[PDB]
């Protein structure tokens, strides 16, 4: 059971309104704990988790410093890529980046990564070897060349193996009774008549963490998944997640069907039916 510390960067040139907006969010597993937004009254790194609110001015003053550093790097990079692709001056483009590390049960770095994208399409990416680069197009190749000469990949794997692993290791400590939890799904079934004369069975799953889950409607062991209706897992905005799936069923047959819930927090999978 591995854990992970990840960061997400975003820059958007906004002609018609103002200057480029920069947004930085940090995640430990499926829980954001930190935030920076350059559209704030006075942009600074802020906690988004109760277990981060005791770090002290030391940490936050330093994190803000780095966040502002990247806000400036990014609005400079925004202009640079426009020149690479030979695009118009007052355009609206996006640059986003994700870096971080997966650290597994023993303490070992499982995988380190750092990839970015220009306007929703891949740009340059650090390979898993933490030594080479993949360039999606010609412009990324330009950037790659400038980074291979500057030996920039070496500074990356330095971070991804040291600072990243260590601070993740202590972020886990600060929020151990919240990050190492495993709240199981609380499932139930609802019944909803259709105009067609049949009914809809909907199986909910509520208040579970982490987010990865599976719902499957059954008929005594047999599946009905490619005539079903799924819904992508959504945040309840409280630290847990929700999801449901539905099937159409002829009137009267309601109790004949069972929905199978699969999640980590459960000892063994659920099987909810209409009651």
């Amino acid at each position: 059971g591995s854990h992970s510390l990840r960061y997400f960067y975003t820059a958007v040139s906004r002609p018609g309104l103002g200057e480029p907006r920069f947004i930085a969010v940090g995640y430990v597993d499926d829980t954001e704990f930190v935030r920076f937004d350059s559209d704030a009254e006075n942009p600074r790194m802020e906690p988004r988790a109760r277990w981060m609110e005791r770090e002290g001015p030391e940490y936050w003053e330093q994190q803000t410093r780095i966040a502002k550093e990247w806000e400036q790097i990014y609005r400079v990079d925004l202009r640079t890529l426009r020149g690479y692709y030979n695009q118009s001056e007052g355009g609206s483009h996006t640059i986003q980046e994700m870096y971080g590390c997966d650290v597994g049960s023993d303490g070992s770095l499982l995988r380190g990564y750092r990839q970015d994208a220009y306007d929703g399409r891949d740009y340059i990416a650090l390979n898993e070897d933490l030594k080479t680069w993949t360039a999606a197009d010609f412009a990324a190749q330009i950037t790659r060349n400038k980074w291979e000469r500057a030996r920039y990949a070496e500074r990356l794997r330095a971070y991804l193996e040291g600072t990243c692993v260590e601070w993740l290791s202590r972020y886990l400590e600060l929020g151990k009774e919240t990050l190492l939890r495993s709240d199981p799904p609380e499932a139930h079934v609802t019944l909803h008549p259709r105009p067609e004369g049949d009914v809809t069975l909907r199986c909910w799953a509520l208040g579970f963490y982490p987010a990865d889950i599976t719902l499957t409607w059954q008929l005594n062991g047999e599946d009905l998944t490619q005539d079903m209706e799924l819904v992508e897992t959504r945040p309840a905005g409280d630290g847990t997640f929700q999801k449901w799936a539905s099937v159409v069923v002829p009137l009267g047959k309601e109790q004949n069907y069972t929905c199978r819930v699969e999640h980590e927090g459960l000892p063994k999978p659920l099987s909810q039916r209409w009651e």
């Binding site: 960061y7 930085a24 940090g26 790194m45 994190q63 780095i66 966040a67 550093e69 990247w70 790097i73 400079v76 990079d77 640079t80 890529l81 870096y99 340059i124 950037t143 400038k146 500057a150 920039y152 500074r155 990356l156 971070y159 600072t163 990243c164 601070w167």
Partner: peptide, 12 residues
């Protein structure tokens, strides 16, 4: 902790 160095530039 956010990544930093930053004298290596890190400009694209």
């Amino acid at each position: 902790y956010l990544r930093y160095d930053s004298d290596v530039g890190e400009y694209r």
